[PDB]
Design an enzyme around this catalytic site. Structure first.
Site, PDB file in Angstrom:
ATOM      1  N   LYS A  41       0.792  -1.182   0.080  1.00 44.08           N
ATOM      2  CA  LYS A  41       0.035   0.018   0.126  1.00 44.08           C
ATOM      3  C   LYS A  41       0.718   1.329  -0.151  1.00 44.08           C
ATOM      4  O   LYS A  41       0.265   2.281  -0.293  1.00 44.08           O
ATOM      5  CB  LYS A  41      -0.889   0.098   1.185  1.00 44.08           C
ATOM      6  CG  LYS A  41      -1.919  -1.037   1.073  1.00 44.08           C
ATOM      7  CD  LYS A  41      -2.987  -0.912  -0.023  1.00 44.08           C
ATOM      8  CE  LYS A  41      -4.218  -1.770   0.313  1.00 44.08           C
ATOM      9  NZ  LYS A  41      -5.165  -1.503  -1.003  1.00 44.08           N
ATOM     10  N   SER A 265      -2.968 -12.665   4.691  1.00 41.83           N
ATOM     11  CA  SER A 265      -3.352 -12.713   3.488  1.00 41.83           C
ATOM     12  C   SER A 265      -2.152 -13.357   2.545  1.00 41.83           C
ATOM     13  O   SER A 265      -2.524 -13.884   1.665  1.00 41.83           O
ATOM     14  CB  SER A 265      -3.717 -11.300   2.676  1.00 41.83           C
ATOM     15  OG  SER A 265      -2.538 -10.490   2.636  1.00 41.83           O
TER      16      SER A 265
END
Ligand SMILES: Cc1ncc(COP(=O)(O)O)c(CN[C@@H](CSC[C@H](N)C(=O)O)C(=O)O)c1O
Ligand code: PLP
Ligand code: 85F
Ligand code: CA
Ligand code: CA
Ligand code: CA
Ligand code: CA
Ligand code: CA
Ligand code: CA
Ligand code: CA
Ligand code: CA
Ligand code: CA
Ligand code: CA
Ligand code: CA
Ligand code: CA
Lengths: 301, 302
Positions: A41, A265
């Site tokens: 990100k 994840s």
């Protein structure tokens, strides 16, 4: 020399899997935890902010405000520290306390919502927060083209360069869908026969079954009340899924066997990829798995 | 950046210029050893100690690796042993950030704790007991193994020289074993005879500067094995610098707030000592390199 930590964003390593049996295909993990903010990100934080700056949307006293499950908040926090911007983040209370630790270390203010109401509740609270800000900019990773465009421009090009344009399969977890969609878009433009698959939580199977649910695969899942605009489903060759416990178990397989410390994840996305490799055994495929973040912020989990 | 394993990501860490914090008319560059895959500079020594012992024939497939550590050397060893499939046992004090035990166990390590009040001496003494229970073992011993300072002599120092095109006036480094300071400073002084090189120690455990030890909170730094480690070379020290616990924490916070650099407590300590040095030598245009030993994530729970 780097002029600031902004110059360290991207150009992340791609690591081959050596000890885990990958069934006659090669699996490579792109380690986005290597970014200075410890997730992919950083890429979208940087592009959303830098394009907003160019468009005249951010003054020195503009308060940046964003709804996040954590990593987009952290990436923004680091970038805002370097740029001397003020950031306020809205996030669910269900996410790892380490995410909060990291944001506050960079000077970001955090507002909490009830995690049982999902990211939708974060977005609603953010509307209330706007009322008290004289001057704000909301990057809005759920709609901002610069989320998938960051990955189209950098993440995908790095994959192509490091593997010398030999890539058969790309597998990536989804939350906003930006990293999957942006990266897959570029890969497919350059490599028409590549297969690209998104992963979602088996317990929140929105794309594969049409409904959401509570799950523990932090960062993944779609809880704003619909499929985000930045997710491009036409790129998905199939929808892959992973159970919560299997994601945690694979996270530990990767650290035990490969010395790769990825997030929950990453466990989910890698499990899905290994299952895919097994179903496609002995084909000599080059398979790339995006690891969205590092595992250090999940030790309390 | 295609890598065969995480071992290939060790080293070649970035040097970042300090832009926002006042550096008193000198340039300060921080070498971010937190960029290593194990998140500290100790990945470099873990790799070299293991690789050299492999070549010596001191590590077979069934050799147990046993090490005393405050955390980072253990983490670096754990990551490398995970890739190489060696069994690792680590002894550590119970008073360190609890992220360290978790990190080490994530890689498969067996972690044995000793009373933190006793320091690293207690850890080393415990190794004696672990050695009696093993048929085959290797102790890297970061305190005595020349492959600790040699790793930094060979890689860390060369990267600093390369990245600043041989223009380095001052190098400031925190100490625990003294290996990163001593190995890097040795190389730098061989290539640049006018360079000044300074170790930093905790102000409340001023062994080198005042000849006594005490409690301190600058995790990873300080010397608590019962004397000065063999790998520290004090002939390289142009002076001994210190940092108080509170100032180290304050500067760790200032780095993350003002530069977006999340370093550990020792990075705050070393950087604070560098800022004090740079203020004492204000406006001389000096190029000052500070080694940031680890990233700050593992300290943020407390
Ligand atoms: C975070 C951190 N900062 C600095 C150092 C010091 O590096 P050198 O050992 O001097 O190269 C470390 C090193 N940590 C070692 C333990 S050093 C000895 C103890 N401080 C003691 O005797 O009390 C380790 O990781 O085991 C570091 O981690
Ligand atoms: C750890 C983690 N994994 C996966 C994702 C999802 O990425 P995207 O928003 O690109 O779908 C995010 C966000 C995240 O922080
Ligand atoms: N990983 C993102 C959030 S993606 C969307 C979220 N998983 C959801 O439940 O909608 C971030 O903000 O870091
Ligand atoms: Ca304007
Ligand atoms: Ca600030
Ligand atoms: Ca084309
Ligand atoms: Ca197709
Ligand atoms: Ca299950
Ligand atoms: Ca190498
Ligand atoms: Ca001045
Ligand atoms: Ca030999
Ligand atoms: Ca093992
Ligand atoms: Ca083990
Ligand atoms: Ca003080
Ligand atoms: Ca804390």
């Amino acid at each position: 020399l780097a002029n600031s930590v902004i110059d360290l964003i991207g150009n992340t390593p791609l690591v081959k899997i050596n000890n885990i049996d990958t069934f006659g295909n090669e699996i490579y993990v792109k380690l986005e935890g290597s970014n200075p903010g410890r997730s992919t990100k950083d890429r979208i934080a940087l592009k959303m902010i830098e394009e907003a700056e160019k468009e005249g949307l951010i003054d020195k006293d503009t308060v940046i405000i964003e709804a996040t499950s954590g990593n987009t908040g952290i990436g923004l926090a680091m970038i805002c520290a370097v740029k001397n911007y003020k950031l306020k983040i809205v996030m669910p209370d269900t996410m790892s306390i380490e995410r909060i630790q990291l944001m506050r270390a960079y000077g970001t203010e955090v507002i909490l919502t009830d995690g049982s109401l999902g990211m939708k509740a974060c977005l609603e609270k953010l509307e209330e927060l706007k009322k008290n800000e004289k001057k704000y900019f909301v990057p809005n990773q759920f709609t901002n083209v610069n989320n998938p465009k960051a990955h189209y421009e950098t993440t995908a090009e790095e994959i192509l360069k490091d593997l010398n344009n030999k890539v058969d399969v790309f597998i990536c977890g989804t939350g906003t869908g930006g990293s999957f969609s942006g990266t897959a878009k570029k890969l497919k433009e350059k490599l028409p026969n590549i297969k690209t698959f998104p992963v979602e939580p088996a317990s929140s199977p929105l794309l594969s079954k049409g409904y959401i649910g509570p799950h523990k695969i932090q960062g993944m899942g779609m809880s704003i009340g619909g499929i985000p605009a930045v997710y491009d489903g036409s790129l998905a060759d199939d929808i892959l899924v992973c159970e919560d416990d299997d994601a945690f178990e694979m996270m530990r397989e990767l650290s035990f066997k490969e010395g790769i410390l990825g997030g929950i994840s990453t466990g989910a996305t890698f499990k899905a990829a290994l299952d895919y490799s097994k179903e496609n055994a002995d084909k000599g495929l080059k398979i790339v798995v995006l690891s969205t973040d590092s595992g250090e912020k999940y030790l309390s989990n």
